[PDB]
Amino acid sequence: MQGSWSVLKKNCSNFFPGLLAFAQQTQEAYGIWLRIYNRQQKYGPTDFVEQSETFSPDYHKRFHSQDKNMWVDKELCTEVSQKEVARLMTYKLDMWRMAHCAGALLATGGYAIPFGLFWLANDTWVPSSFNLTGEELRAWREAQDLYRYRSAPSYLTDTKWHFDFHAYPWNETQERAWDDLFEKNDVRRDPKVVRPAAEMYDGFIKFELIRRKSLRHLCRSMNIPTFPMLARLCNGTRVRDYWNLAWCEDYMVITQRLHESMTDEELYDYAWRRYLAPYDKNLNREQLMERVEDYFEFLGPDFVAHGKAPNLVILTNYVLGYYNDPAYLEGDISELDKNDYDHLASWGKDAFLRRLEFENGPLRDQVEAHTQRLLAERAAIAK
């Protein structure tokens, strides 16, 4: 979304109340995170707590491993509720953006003020706390969805093009899953058909081998600030933490069937945090429930059985596929009756163009026959 004066006025008016609300949310989220971190350190697996090292097979660069460095706390409901987890995730996003802005301010002293003016003129990178009314919140969500639309197609295309150019699926079912994975949101994708793509891509690329450019695109699509990007293991850590929280909440909801009892707005927010339901689509409860059930089905039974989610790259692609809108086409079909090269009509045809028209025109067969006969006669005379 482009900046505007109205949004600038809105954010300037709500600047200090927004900061106060952000501080209160910071205290609450620190409490929640303290509970969660204590639980992880106490009951977490040895590899997860000790931060086991997983190195790439080519350049031996460490990155988070989905199996070892990610853990689903099945018993987190006792200490932390689902709403607290959602609050923590939202605060994590807001705190990331605020921390980047504060770092810029500290780095550049008082010279960041005009850049702050640019910042407050757009809702893309402002915290949710800056909105004090429903309309402002709707505009902020619209800006976030616009950024997601802007960013996701690049990530999807990167993944698909790299895999298709450097590899092909093994079997027909994998082919169908791969082809149907990257369909536009206007059609409904069957998670059962699409799941094998997760194993196929695990064979190709895991989350531990994700490239830095693809990571940048993904972080853009998740509304995670990317500047300064730095090494790939910082935003990678952010992504891992966010999706670990999301998986814990998803396990809680699946086990307790909370989504059925969840209200309409809370359900919409829950889907949105999973990048499943844009607000500009004006989805109803039926569609939200369908998408959430499809997401749970894609996670698969193994997620509940052992807390193991499918490949995170493929999961991110699948969820972001809902922001891959069909390519725009505007204009009545009658426009196809016009011509594009009328301005050249005055130039006419030169000798070469006339020759080409004569040779390759409707008389082409006659010209070919005459030319071949003449050439054969000349060759015979030569011999």
């Binding site: 616009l146 802007r150 809108d325 204009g331 050249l344 130039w347 390759n360």
Partner: protein, 87 residues
């Protein structure tokens, strides 16, 4: 017929290129210079061979105009600029 250009070829022969399959083949066995179907495609032999297509007046059974609902997609975004506008 007009003197207007057509789909660009890059001075390449489509019967031997690495993506030749993407170009339809006509009855005469000459692959088209474009994804479209061409009946009078030809090949010329200079130092290198190159494909050519001569525009001509040909009548094609025109399917009736559909409704705007089934081909228009109003997903336009502020950043989007169409190819015509870019040109």
């Amino acid at each position: 017929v007009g003197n207007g250009p057509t789909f660009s070829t890059g001075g390449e022969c489509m019967n031997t290129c690495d993506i030749q399959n993407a170009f339809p083949m006509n009855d005469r066995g000459v692959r088209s210079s474009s994804p479209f179907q061409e009946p009078n495609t030809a090949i010329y032999d200079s130092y290198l061979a190159w494909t050519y297509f001569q525009p001509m007046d040909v009548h094609i059974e025109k399917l009736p105009a559909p409704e705007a609902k089934y081909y228009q997609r109003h997903t336009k975004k502020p950043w989007d600029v169409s190819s015509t506008e870019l040109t």
